Amino acid sequence: SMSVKKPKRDDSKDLALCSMILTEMETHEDAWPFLLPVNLKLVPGYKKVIKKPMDFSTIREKLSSGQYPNLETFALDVRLVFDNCETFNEDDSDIGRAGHNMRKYFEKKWTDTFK
Numbered sequence: 001s002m003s004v005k006k007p008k009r010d011d012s013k014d015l016a017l018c019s020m021i022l023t024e025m026e027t028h029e030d031a032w033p034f035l036l037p038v039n040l041k042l043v044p045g046y047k048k049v050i051k052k053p054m055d056f057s058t059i060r061e062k063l064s065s066g067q068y069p070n071l072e073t074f075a076l077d078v079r080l081v082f083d084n085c086e087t088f089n090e091d092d093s094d095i096g097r098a099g100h101n102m103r104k105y106f107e108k109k110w111t112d113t114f115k
């Protein structure tokens with residue numbers, strides 16, 4: 001509360017470390033459905049159903065331009081990419097399995113790097 005603070009967690013490396021995680025998601029072989037925005041003119045249903053589209057190239061551009069205020073707003077957008085992918089794709093599809101697999105990859109790097 002006023003003039004009463006928990007001890008300051010060192011966040012000065014968070015930017016670099018998020019950037020590294022994002023690199024490793026970008027280079028995973030199952031990243032391909034997630035590298036670029038879904039094309040909303042060519043994919044019937046996507047625009048109306050998926051209210052906040054998100055993809056790695058967009059998170060990378062937000063990260064590089066100071067558009068994440070902290071750690072956690074960066075994880076929310078990474079998770080959004082997989083929550084969208086679950087919303088639109090059957091679990092038994094190459095893209096539905098790709099999304100489950102990248103989400104597990106991401107949550108272990110997230111936990112190891114930061115919890």
Ligand SMILES: CN(C)C(=O)c1ccc2nccnc2c1
Pocket residue numbers: 033034038039042043084085088089095
């Ligand atoms: C995340 N991602 C790649 C999608 O969710 C999606 C799913 C099905 C598609 N079908 C035709 C063309 N693009 C598509 C894109």
